C-alpha cells in the first residue's frame, strides 16, 4: 500500500471520468482510513508534492484542507513538517523549492488550515530581511519575491483579516524596491528596445502586477480553487498557527538566485480571433507563465508527456494557450544567463507540440518566428545564436520549408546588420545538417548571395611539398617525414606550412581521414609546435587550408587541443588575431572559443573529482595521503591554467574594444557600429556562460583588468556581472 | 524525497535489442549498457556524411568519437553509425531529444550500445550491408534501392 499511496496522491488532478471534487472527496476518505498506521508516509508524500508539483498547488492544499477538517492533529503535524522542510530547503540553498513551499503555506490559509495572522507574521519577518545590513541584494530580492509571488493565491484573505498590518508590509516593500540597484538589467534583457514590449525587471514587473491586483479588490480570473466547492466542510474546520519564523541568517556559504528579466513578445493583438490574452501587468499572466514553466520543469525528460501536459493546462477562464506555450518556451530558450534545460530539448518539444495541435500550433509558431526576426535589431547576440540554432534545426525536420521572400528586406540592408547576418548564419547552419547543393535549391535565386560557400580545401618550398606528398601516399613512417623536412629554407615557419598544407590536403575527404592523419603523424606535429609561436602558426596555416569549411576548423582545433598539439592559450590568441579579423563576427569563431573554454573547465573538474574520490577513500579507511598532496598540486596548476585562459581572453577584449572606442572619438564617428555590438556582447557572453568560475577571479579582475581607468562602456559589462550575485 | 512519476525517463530505458557477437552473458551486457556513453544510430541514409552526424549529435554534448557504419566488402557507408560521448548525461540527452527526429530528412533511431569493438563497424548482412537491407521489399533511394 506504500506504492499504492504514492500513485493515488499523484493521480488526483489528472484526466478522470469523475470530477476533481469527487476524486478529492474520495482520496481524503481513503487517506483518513490509512492514518492509523501510515501517518508518517502520508505526511512525507504530501510534503514532497508540495515541493515538487507547484503546478498542482491548489489541488493539494484542498486535499490537506479536507484532511484537516476530518482530523485536526494531522493538519497540525503537516504544518510542522512543512516548516521543517522549508528550513531544510533554505539551509541547502534551494531557494527555488522554498518559494513553492511558501506559496503552499499561503494557499493553506484559503483552506482554513493555517490562521491568517500567522502568515502575516511570517511575511512581516520575510520583508524585514530588506532592513538587514551587510547582506547582498539577491538575498533581499528573494525574500520579497517569496512574499509578492504568494499574493495571487492568498492576497485577498490576508488583506481582509489584517489590512493594517499588510499596509506596513507594502510600505516597507515599496521603499525597498525604490532603492534597489538595477545594474544587471542590460545584461539579462533579450531585447534592449522597449517597443513593442519593455523587457521588465522581474521584481518591478511582479510589483506592478500585485498593485493592479490590489486595485481590483484582490479579484483574479485564472487560478482554479477546488476548495471553494467544499465551502461547507472547510468553514467549520479549525485552524493552526504557524510558529514564529526567523529567516536563516546570511553566511558566506549562502547562494541566492540570480535576478531575472521577464521575457515578453505577445499581447492580445497578436491573437485577435482567440480569447483575450491577459496583459503584461496582470497576475493572470504571471500565474499562467509560472505554471507552464513548472510543467516543463516537471516533465522536461519526457518530450511527448511534456507536450501533452502543456496542451491540457487547466484554468478557470479561457486563454490563448498556444500563444502562452510558445512564449514560455522561447522565454526559457532565450533566458540569460542560461536556459533552465539543454537548448535542444526546446526544438523537440516544439515539434511534439506541432504534432499534438497540427491545425493551430504551427501557425502560431510561424507567426512568432516572424516576430522574432522583425525584432532582431536589438536582440542580444547570445539569444541570436540560440535562435539561429533552433530555427535551422527546426527547418531540418520539415524539409527546409520556409517562406524566404517574407524576409526580402534583409537583401537591401548592410550585410553586417542583424537581419541579413541572421539569414546568412541560418543558411550556413542548414548546410551543415544537409549539403551545399540542397541549400541553393530551397532558397529563392535572390537569396543565393546570402548562401554559404562550398566547403572545399584550399591547397597551396615548392619541391619539398611534392616530396612529402609522395611519402604520405607511400605509407611512410614519422622518421622519414621528419627527415624530408630538413630541406627547407628559413626566412622555422615554412616547415609547418609545407607539412600542414600537404597532410590536410591528402586527408581532406572526411573528418575520420583528417582525424587519422593527426593521430598517425602526432609526433611530427608535437615536434613542430612545441614552441608557443609554433602552435600559433599551426592554427594560422590550418585556417588558410580550411577557411571555407568552418565545421572542419572547429573539429580540428578540438582534436589538436585534446592531443596537446596546441593548448587553450594558443587558440585564445589565435581567435583575437588579425587572421580571423574578417571572420570575427561569424558564429564559428565563438563556437571554437567556447568549446575551448569548456575543455579547460572539464579538465579542472576531472582533476577536482579525482581529488575528492581520494579524500573520501581516506575517510572510509579511517602513501594515499601523499597522493592527495600530489592531486592538490595538479588542481592548483590546472586552476592556474584555467584562470590564465580567462585573463588572456578578457585582456584581448579590453584591448580591441579600447582600440575601437579611442578611434571613434578621435575620428568623430559613431560608437554603436555592427562590429561593436557583436564584440561587446561576446564579452558579455563570456561572463554569462561562466559566471560561477569567473566569480573566483574577482580580486584579480577588480585590481588588474576591470579598473576605474577603463571606458565606462567596457566597465559596465563587468559591473553588470558583479550584480548577478551582489 | 522524490516521486517515481517524475523520475520517469522512458527515452533512456533499454531497447529489446542485444548483440549476438557479444562475448558474454545477457546480465553482463545489460550492466555495460546501463553505464555506456555509446549509441547505435540506425536508419541513416547511405549519403549521410560525418559532417551531418557531428552537427546534430553535438547538440546534446561534446562528441568523443563517431565510427561510421561500413559495408563489410565495399567499405562504403551502409546506413548506420556509432556515437561516443565523454559523459553518460550527454548520451542520455541524445537519446531523449535526437532519437526519433530527422537527419537528412529521415527519422533516425538511437540505441544504447555495450561498447564499440573492432569488427562491429561492418554490416553483418550476407551481401555486406546491414541485415535490415536484405529481407525488405520496399524501395528506398537513400538505403540503396530494393533489397537483396
Amino acid at each position: 500500500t506504500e506504492d499504492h499511496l504514492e500513485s493515488l496522491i499523484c493521480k488526483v488532478g489528472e484526466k478522470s471520468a469523475c470530477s476533481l471534487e469527487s476524486n478529492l472527496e474520495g482520496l481524503a476518505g481513503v487517506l483518513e482510513a490509512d492514518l492509523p498506521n501510515y501517518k508518517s508516509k502520508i505526511l512525507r508524500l504530501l510534503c514532497t508534492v508540495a515541493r515538487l508539483l507547484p503546478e498542482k498547488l491548489t489541488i493539494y492544499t484542498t486535499l490537506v484542507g479536507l484532511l484537516n477538517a476530518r482530523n485536526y492533529n494531522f493538519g497540525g503535524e503537516f504544518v510542522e513538517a512543512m516548516i521543517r522542510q522549508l528550513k531544510e530547503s533554505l539551509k541547502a540553498n534551494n531557494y527555488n523549492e522554498a518559494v513553492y513551499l511558501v506559496r503552499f503555506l499561503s494557499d493553506l490559509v484559503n483552506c482554513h488550515v493555517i490562521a491568517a495572522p500567522s502568515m502575516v507574521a511570517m511575511f512581516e519577518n520575510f520583508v524585514s530581511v530588506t532592513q538587514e545590513e551587510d547582506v547582498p541584494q539577491v538575498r533581499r530580492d528573494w525574500y520579497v519575491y517569496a512574499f509578492l509571488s504568494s499574493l495571487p493565491w492568498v492576497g485577498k484573505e490576508l488583506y481582509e483579516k489584517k489590512d493594517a498590518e499588510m499596509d506596513r508590509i507594502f510600505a516597507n516593500t515599496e521603499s525597498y524596491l525604490k532603492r534597489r540597484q538595477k545594474t544587471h538589467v542590460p545584461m539579462l534583457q533579450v531585447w534592449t528596445a522597449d517597443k513593442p514590449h519593455p523587457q521588465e525587471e522581474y521584481l518591478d514587473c511582479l510589483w506592478a502586477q500585485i498593485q493592479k491586483l490590489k486595485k481590483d479588490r484582490w479579484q483574479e480570473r485564472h487560478i482554479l480553487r477546488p476548495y471553494l466547492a467544499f465551502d461547507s466542510i472547510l468553514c467549520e474546520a479549525l485552524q493552526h498557527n504557524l510558529p514564529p519564523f526567523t529567516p536563516p541568517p546570511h553566511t558566506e556559504d549562502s547562494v541566492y538566485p540570480m535576478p531575472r528579466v521577464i521575457f515578453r513578445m505577445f499581447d492580445y493583438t497578436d491573437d485577435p480571433e482567440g480569447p483575450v490574452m491577459p496583459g503584461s501587468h496582470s497576475v493572470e499572466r504571471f500565474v499562467i507563465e509560472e505554471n507552464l514553466h513548472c510543467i516543463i520543469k516537471s516533465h522536461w525528460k519526457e518530450r511527448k508527456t511534456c507536450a501533452a501536459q502543456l496542451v491540457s493546462y487547466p484554468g478557470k477562464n479561457k486563454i490563448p494557450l498556444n500563444y502562452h506555450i510558445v512564449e514560455v518556451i522561447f522565454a526559457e530558450l532565450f533566458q540569460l544567463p542560461a536556459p533552465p534545460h539543454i537548448d535542444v530539448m526546446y526544438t523537440t518539444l516544439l515539434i511534439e507540440l506541432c504534432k499534438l495541435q497540427p491545425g493551430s500550433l504551427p501557425q502560431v509558431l510561424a507567426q512568432a518566428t516572424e516576430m522574432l526576426y522583425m525584432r532582431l535589431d536589438t536582440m542580444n547576440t547570445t539569444c541570436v545564436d540560440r535562435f539561429i540554432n533552433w530555427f535551422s534545426h527546426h527547418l531540418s525536420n520539415f524539409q527546409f520549408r520556409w517562406s524566404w521572400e517574407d524576409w526580402s528586406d534583409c537583401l537591401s540592408q548592410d550585410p553586417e546588420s542583424p537581419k541579413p547576418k541572421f539569414v546568412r548564419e541560418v543558411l550556413e547552419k542548414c548546410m551543415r545538417l544537409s549539403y551545399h547543393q540542397r541549400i541553393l535549391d530551397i532558397v529563392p535565386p535572390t537569396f543565393s548571395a546570402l548562401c554559404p560557400v562550398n566547403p572545399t580545401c584550399i591547397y597551396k618550398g615548392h619541391s619539398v611539398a611534392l616530396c612529402l606528398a609522395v611519402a604520405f601516399k607511400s605509407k611512410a613512417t614519422n622518421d622519414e617525414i621528419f627527415s624530408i623536412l630538413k630541406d627547407v629554407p628559413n626566412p622555422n615557419p615554412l616547415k609547418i606550412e609545407v607539412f600542414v598544407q600537404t597532410l590536410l590536403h591528402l586527408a581532406a575527404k572526411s573528418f575520420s581521414h583528417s582525424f587519422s592523419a593527426l593521430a598517425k603523424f602526432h609526433e611530427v606535429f608535437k615536434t613542430l609546435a612545441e614552441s608557443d609561436e609554433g602552435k600559433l602558426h599551426v592554427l594560422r596555416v590550418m585556417f588558410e587550408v580550411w577557411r571555407n569549411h568552418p565545421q572542419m576548423i572547429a573539429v580540428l582545433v578540438d582534436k589538436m587541443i585534446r592531443t596537446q598539439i596546441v593548448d587553450c592559450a594558443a587558440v585564445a590568441n589565435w581567435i583575437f588575431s588579425s587572421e580571423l579579423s574578417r571572420d570575427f563576427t561569424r558564429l564559428f569563431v565563438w563556437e571554437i572559443l567556447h568549446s575551448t573554454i569548456r575543455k579547460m573547465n572539464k579538465h579542472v573538474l576531472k582533476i577536482q573529482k579525482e581529488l575528492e574520490e581520494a579524500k573520501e577513500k581516506l575517510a572510509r579507511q579511517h602513501v594515499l595521503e601523499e597522493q592527495i598532496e600530489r592531486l592538490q598540486e595538479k588542481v592548483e596548476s590546472a586552476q592556474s591554467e584555467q584562470k590564465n585562459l580567462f585573463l588572456v581572453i578578457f585582456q584581448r577584449f579590453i584591448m580591441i574594444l579600447t582600440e575601437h572606442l579611442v578611434r571613434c572619438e578621435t575620428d568623430g564617428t559613431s560608437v554603436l557600429t555592427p562590429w561593436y555590438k557583436n564584440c561587446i556582447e561576446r564579452l558579455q557572453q563570456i561572463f554569462l556562460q561562466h559566471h560561477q568560475i569567473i566569480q573566483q577571479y574577482m580580486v584579480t579582475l577588480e585590481n588588474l583588468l576591470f579598473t576605474a581607468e577603463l571606458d565606462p562602456h567596457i566597465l559596465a559589462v563587468f559591473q553588470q556581472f558583479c550584480a548577478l550575485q551582489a | 524525497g522524490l516521486l517515481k512519476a517524475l523520475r520517469s525517463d522512458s527515452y533512456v530505458e533499454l531497447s529489446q535489442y542485444r548483440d549476438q557477437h557479444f562475448r558474454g552473458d545477457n546480465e553482463e551486457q545489460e550492466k555495460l549498457l546501463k553505464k555506456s556513453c555509446t549509441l547505435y544510430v540506425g536508419n541513416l541514409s547511405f549519403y549521410t556524411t560525418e559532417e551531418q552526424i557531428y552537427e546534430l549529435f553535438s547538440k546534446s554534448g561534446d562528441i568523443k568519437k563517431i565510427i561510421m557504419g561500413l559495408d563489410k566488402m565495399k567499405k562504403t557507408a551502409c546506413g548506420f553509425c556509432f556515437v561516443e560521448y565523454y559523459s553518460r548525461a550527454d548520451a542520455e540527452n541524445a537519446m531523449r531529444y535526437i532519437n526519433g527526429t530527422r537527419l537528412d530528412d529521415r527519422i533516425i533511431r538511437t540505441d544504447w550500445d555495450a561498447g564499440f569493438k573492432e569488427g562491429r563497424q561492418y554490416g553483418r548482412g550476407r551481401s555486406g550491408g546491414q541485415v535490415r537491407d536484405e529481407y525488405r521489399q520496399d524501395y528506398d533511394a537513400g538505403r540503396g534501392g530494393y533489397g537483396k
Binding site: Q437, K509, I561, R562, T563, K599 | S45, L70, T76
Partner: peptide, 14 residues
Amino acid sequence: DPRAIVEYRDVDFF
C-alpha cells in the same frame, strides 16, 4: 541525392 556514397577505407591527454 546528387552526391557519392563515401568510402572509408583506412588517446586524450588534456
